[PDB]
């Protein structure tokens, strides 16, 4: 079975599956955990940075795409660089040509289509990374989840990566609570750190290990790392 239909992205299995896409999705699951959640005034990204050795650094997982948009990655880093770079350009085009900040919903559609092209053609490969996009546009705070399959969804909160399921159930529970953390960023972040720690097991989020990013009403997308996150551990 499978082995005969997972050679490339241009082949359907007898049941209508695309194994190369599914294998790419597997790279995400193997990726470190990251969480996203938003209220009505802000959107926050909390990510667990993973390190190779105790002599290495903890690879960044948050990329700023524009003053009002940014994302967190889980999986192949290079593929995140590519996708975020495309996103940086789309945001840029919107401003330069229309003097308009790109709507998070549109950014999601653009990403979906860019990924879709690498799943119907020969020679290419699906992207092997998941992304969580947060942003504040003309319709408030937003959070999107991007999967290599090309599927992008808007949520109040979510998580991806290894053991992400923990944090996700927590948010699905804490929903009515954080969705109302309006006008108070520190609370939204704390609520995020709490959701993410619901996926810990190995260790505990340290200073050079935790990474947080926020954007909102009067807050340009900014990334906090190290000493800057100390007050949240």
């Amino acid at each position: 079975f499978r082995n005969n239909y997972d050679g490339d992205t241009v082949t359907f299995s007898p049941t209508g599956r695309l194994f190369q896409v599914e294998y790419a999705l597997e790279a995400i699951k193997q990726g470190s955990v990251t969480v996203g959640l938003r209220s009505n005034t802000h959107a926050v990204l909390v990510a667990l940075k993973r390190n190779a050795d105790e002599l290495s650094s903890y690879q960044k997982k948050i990329i700023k795409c524009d003053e009002h948009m940014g994302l967190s990655l889980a999986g192949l880093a290079p593929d995140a660089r590519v996708l975020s770079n495309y996103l940086r350009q789309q945001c840029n085009y919107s401003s330069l040509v229309f003097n308009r900040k790109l709507a998070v919903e549109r950014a999601g559609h653009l990403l979906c289509d860019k990924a879709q092209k690498n799943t119907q053609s020969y020679g290419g490969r699906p992207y092997g990374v998941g992304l969580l996009i947060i942003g504040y546009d003309k319709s408030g705070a937003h959070l999107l989840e991007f999967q290599p399959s090309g599927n992008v969804t808007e949520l109040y909160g979510t998580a991806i990566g290894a053991r992400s399921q923990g944090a996700k159930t927590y948010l699905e529970r804490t929903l009515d609570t954080f969705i109302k953390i309006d006008g108070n960023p520190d609370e939204l972040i704390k609520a995020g750190v709490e959701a993410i720690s619901q996926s810990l097991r190995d260790e505990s989020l340290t200073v050079d290990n935790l990474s947080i990013a926020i954007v909102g009403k009067d807050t340009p997308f900014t990334i906090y790392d190290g000493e800057a996150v100390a007050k949240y551990i």
């Binding site: 330069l96 040509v97 229309f98 003097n99 308009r100 709507a103 919903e105 549109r106 003309k138 319709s139």
Partner: protein, 233 residues
């Protein structure tokens, strides 16, 4: 590089306390031949923007098609198309300005002078100009072609500087505009008596008046004038 064939003359405009007014006659000249008379040179985009165009008519029609497409395209996958994500006058202008400059940069201009008038979502008035060279500028009053020489001097007597805007009413403004159109009909040999005028008010919305006519013209003193110097009868 080209040369205009069928052309539209002046487009004049000004802003008042609650919005902006823009007018343009209905003539389509062919050199010194007043060839076409039912030409609308004011293009409404949505209900918060009107684009006034002068210069080559064939290019004007092209810009019209472009504007219709902008509306269609903005509606795609946009659940807030008629709300938070509808086309702003500033978006429509930046777009056209982009095109105008790219075309002059390829040495193939859209032979026009354009004035975009409208009211932003936050109520702010919008009045900016762009022409075949890609040049752009804003002023409490804007006019193209002949109107720049004869309409601006009259319109500026109403709003000489920014602080005159709040002190100017739709009645005063519309009156200034209508008078300017009469003056242009007197001295501009490429003007028509028939014209359209549109008002974009932050409260009353977009009012588009068609088939207006210059009225109350003074011609009687002509009977007294004879000869070109010494002739008496």
């Amino acid at each position: 590089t080209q040369q205009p064939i069928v052309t539209g003359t002046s487009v004049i405009s000004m802003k008042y306390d609650n919005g902006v007014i823009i007018a343009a006659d209905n003539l389509g000249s062919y050199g010194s031949l007043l060839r076409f008379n039912g030409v609308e040179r004011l293009i409404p985009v949505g209900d918060n923007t009107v684009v006034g165009i002068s210069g080559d008519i064939s290019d004007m029609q092209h810009i019209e098609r472009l504007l219709k497409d902008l509306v269609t395209e903005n509606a795609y996958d946009n659940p807030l198309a008629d709300a938070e994500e509808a086309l702003e006058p500033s978006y429509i202008f930046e777009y056209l300005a982009t095109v105008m400059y790219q075309r002059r940069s390829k040495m193939n201009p859209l032979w026009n002078a354009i004035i975009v008038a409208g009211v932003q979502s936050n109520g702010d008035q919008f009045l900016r100009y762009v022409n075949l060279l890609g040049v752009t500028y804003s002023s409490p009053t804007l006019a193209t072609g002949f109107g720049a020489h004869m309409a601006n001097p009259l319109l500026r007597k109403v709003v000489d500087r920014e602080s005159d805007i709040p002190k100017t009413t739709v009645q005063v403004a519309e009156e200034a505009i209508v008078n300017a159109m009469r003056v242009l009909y007197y001295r501009d040999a490429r003007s028509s008596r028939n014209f359209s005028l549109a008002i974009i008010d932050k409260n009353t919305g977009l009012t588009f008046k068609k088939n207006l006519q210059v009225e109350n013209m003074k011609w009687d003193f002509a009977k007294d004038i004879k000869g070109y110097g010494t002739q008496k009868i």
